[PDB]
């Protein structure tokens, strides 16, 4: 969602 946090390209925390 907007829950996912992307710290660098092609990466995410909290990915759905």
């Amino acid at each position, epitope marked *: 969602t*907007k*829950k996912s946090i992307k710290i660098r390209p092609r990466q995410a925390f909290y990915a759905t």
Partner: antibody
Amino acid sequence: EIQLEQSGAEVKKSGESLKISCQTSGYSFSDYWIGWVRQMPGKGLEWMGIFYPGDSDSRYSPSFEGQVTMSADRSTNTAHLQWSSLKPSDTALYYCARLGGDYEDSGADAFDFWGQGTLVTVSS
Amino acid sequence: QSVLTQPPSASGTPGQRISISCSGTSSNVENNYVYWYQHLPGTAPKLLIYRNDHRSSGIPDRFSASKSGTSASLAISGLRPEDEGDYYCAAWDDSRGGPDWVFGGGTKLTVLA
């Protein structure tokens, strides 16, 4: 237009409990993380943590785990920060900010809209 | 790992170009996204640059940023009296393997009046 409106300045005695607030407008409150940032007098900005109102998930900075509690009231679109026992060293300006950016279809990565700050003074 | 180091202060005269630096580690500035904030008296911190070098909407093009290895730099050309205040780099730090946000120490910019 997105706005975060923080509660008014506080003057407290050490040992006393306090809850400060950040009420949000102009976007879906459940869908974005909110962060909290401390600024001690004469010092720089320090990240404290983030809180996700949609499901109450949270992440604290190491220095802050167990020292302060983030929460949210979805009935009023308000995020809160609370201490049970204020110390003089909690004297600071406190900001809430939305984690957003909306640079891509999904996700968040930058603190974009900020509250105006709440000053908290604590004395023994 | 989880610290951004900036010079505590800088100054310049109106119309000069100046540059603000920020040193990180492999945990933050080298591989993750870096941001820059202005903090002016009486106002909340304001995002100037996101994702290393992207200027934020509405910020004038006299603000720019770059990143080389563990260093990042904010350039302000055409310095104005209005620019005096505090400038912070920020980054994501993944040392604990999650999303930790870190602000730099802050640089106080004086525009010599």
